[PDB]
Amino acid sequence: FRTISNFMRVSDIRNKIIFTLLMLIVFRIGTFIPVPSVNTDVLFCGGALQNFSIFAMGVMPYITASIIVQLLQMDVVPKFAEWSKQGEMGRRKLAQFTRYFTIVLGFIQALGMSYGFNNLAGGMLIQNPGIGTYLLIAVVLTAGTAFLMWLGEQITAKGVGNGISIIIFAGIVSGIPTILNQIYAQTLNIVRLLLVALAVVAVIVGVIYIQQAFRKIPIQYAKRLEGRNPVGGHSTHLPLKVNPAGVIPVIFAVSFLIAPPTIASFFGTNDVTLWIRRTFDYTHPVGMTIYVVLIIAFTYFYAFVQVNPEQMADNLKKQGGYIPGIRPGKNTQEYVTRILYRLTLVGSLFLAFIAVLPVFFVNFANLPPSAQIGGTSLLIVVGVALETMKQLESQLVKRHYRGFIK
């Protein structure tokens, strides 16, 4: 196509996209190296295909540290709130604490992941299962996560787009081809798979339609009088997304849906352990309904954390502008709150339907159960692809300054 050829023509865009592909090569190279004290020649429960690499932690603890540090800013740690009101230097200090938090949480989750991995294969996964080798491979996994964050910062400095987003996208799309190999090895089946592919493309179109939509609240400004009549096409407004959270409520819902099975397996095996494990399975229609309700409640909570209509009404009043017709104190807060109620209902139902779609895909296509094609990984892939394309179009567009002589 035209824009991709123009990306390859421009020296800077082609150079940084080459550097991005090289960093993804480096990521895949680090994936194909195993941890020292692990056997891994025992190839396999399910969905644990490689899963025991240097990057087996992934960038999971950086996202967990980021959502934790982001959650603490709304008046739990007032030191963090005053970091958040200090400006860019306070945000730099928050990012430094985020780096410390992701190193610490990567160590903790590496310990838990290693002790669970030894608990999974039958004990014969790790050789000499002592605490010293657990500390060793926890250091290895946290070093893998630290190198992944360093790769993200390198690929957002000299590379294309966001760093962590490109790495998460790399993880998902590198998980695609083994799923395709399992499909082709497993197999009216062909027209069934074609109908699933048509449903996947329809779901991608629906995801782009929901995601790239804005509610444009118009905003007048008091300080700058519009003394000249403009073309009106680029008027100032406040865009609210339809899905203001993203995929964070799915993380909160799966935390709430896997915590009682882990504590019920901690308790031991009783009747209530079997009842908890049978009733908190979201593949079954008593667990899926709890999953949907948790997703809806958590996206309401998280989009009131994200937008925060009281703080945005305060920010609108404190510098000038307002919404035309509405007084800028309490009334803009109630107005933006009602707009947010409607939009969060729509984006809520969208996110819940997307998150429970692979349950109805496995029970219609009879795919491998560890596929989960059409989940929230689709949402992450679509968001990273469209944001990276928008960034590349911006860097392409600057050059397109013509002038009236031409």
Binding site: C45, G47, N51, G58, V59, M60, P61, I63, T64, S66, I67, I68, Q70, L71, L72, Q73, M74, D75, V76, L105, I108, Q109, G112, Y115, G116, F117, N119, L120, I164, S165, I168, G171, I172, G246, V247, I248, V250, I251, F252, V254, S255, L257, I258, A259, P261, T262, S265, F266, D281, Y282, G287, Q306, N315, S370, Q372, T376, S377, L379, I380, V384
Partner: protein
């Protein structure tokens, strides 16, 4: 209030961090290895001018 639900959410996501104290019961309705790949980076939160009149 909202500090209570916020700290409940934070302690539950740290329980997600240590949600690997059991992994054995081999493949069933377990989402943790599935939740290894559902993340995005969460989005961040959010004088007088003058001019020279050429006299």
């Amino acid at each position: 209030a909202k500090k209570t639900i916020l700290f409940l959410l934070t302690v539950l996501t740290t329980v997600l961090v240590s949600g690997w104290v059991v992994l054995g019961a081999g493949c069933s309705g377990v989402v943790i290895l599935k939740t290894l790949h559902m993340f995005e980076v969460p989005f961040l939160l959010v004088d007088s001018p003058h001019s020279y009149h050429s006299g």
